[PDB]
Amino acid sequence: XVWLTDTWVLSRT
Amino acid sequence: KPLPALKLALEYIVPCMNKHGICVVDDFLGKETGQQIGDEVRALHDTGKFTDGQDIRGDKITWIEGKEPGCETIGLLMSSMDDLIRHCNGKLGSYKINGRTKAMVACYPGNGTGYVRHVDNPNGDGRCVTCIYYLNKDWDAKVSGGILRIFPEGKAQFADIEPKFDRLLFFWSDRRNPHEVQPAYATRYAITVWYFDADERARAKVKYL
Ligand SMILES: O=C(O)CCC(=O)C(=O)O
Ligand SMILES: [Mn+2]
């Protein structure tokens, strides 16, 4: 549920 | 529990695209739907439906509207992409997104095939967002290559996107994002839709004879 905002990847699960 | 589409769009896709111009959502549809889409794509390939995508590009492609028999799950993927764009509610840049292409189902058939560095829409043809879904179970660029390398303008570092199973990718289609498909050494599949800005598209900078 965590977005590292300097990156552009997030898992939806 | 997968994040709901509305929340995924408003709380991640929109801010990520406006900050970086590239946005990856992993585990977009889950294993069952992803494998179903893979089966549909492999069926299209196996029955000879692809043609040359072309020196510049070594992919084989076919265009899918979404309602064709045997492409039901691809149609579900396309409607899910559409839902996400709708939920973005005009917050992607200043674009007014009102149309899109059919789905381009593409295969790089190993053997070092790729796509040289290019910009998707360099001539103002209306396409503002590129949306790609990858369906390669257990893909590992260490073995099979096939990385999509994006070279965002104004940044010194490049962005490497592995064509991972169940991965959805957005990026601005204009000159901000030159990119290449690095040589692929296994069968690499992906499905692309491009979304149109209504005004740019209506300017008809490209006439197709
Ligand atoms: O498959 C990919 O990662 C990108 C393909 C691409 O650049 C294209 O078809 O324009
Ligand atoms: Mn491209």
Residue numbers in the entry:
A (entry chain B): 1 to 13
B (entry chain A): 186 to 239, 250 to 404
What text does the study give?
The degradation of HIFα subunits is promoted by post-translational hydroxylation of prolyl-residues located in its N/C-terminal oxygen dependent degradation domains (NODD and CODD). These dioxygen-sensitive reactions are catalysed by 2-oxoglutarate (2OG) and Fe(II) dependent prolyl hydroxylases (PHD 1–3 in humans). The human PHDs catalyse hydroxylation of prolyl-residues within the N/C terminal ODDs of HIF-1/2/3α and are negative regulators of the transcriptionally regulated hypoxic response.
We successfully crystallized cPHD2 in the presence of a 14-residue NCCP (3C), obtained in a RaPID with five rounds of screening. Consistent with the reported NMR studies, we obtained multiple crystal structures revealing that 3C binds in the region of cPHD2 immediately to the N-terminal side of the core distorted double stranded β-helix (DSBH) fold of PHD2. Interestingly, within the crystal lattice, 3C ‘slots’ into a tight groove between the non-DSBH β1 of one cPHD2 molecule and the C-terminal α4 (that is also involved in the P63 crystal packing) of a neighbouring symmetry related cPHD2 molecule. In the cPHD2.3C complex structures, 3C adopts a rectangular fold comprising two (almost) planar distorted β-strands connected by two type II beta turns with DY1, D6, W8 and T13 at its four corners; most of the side chains do not protrude extensively.
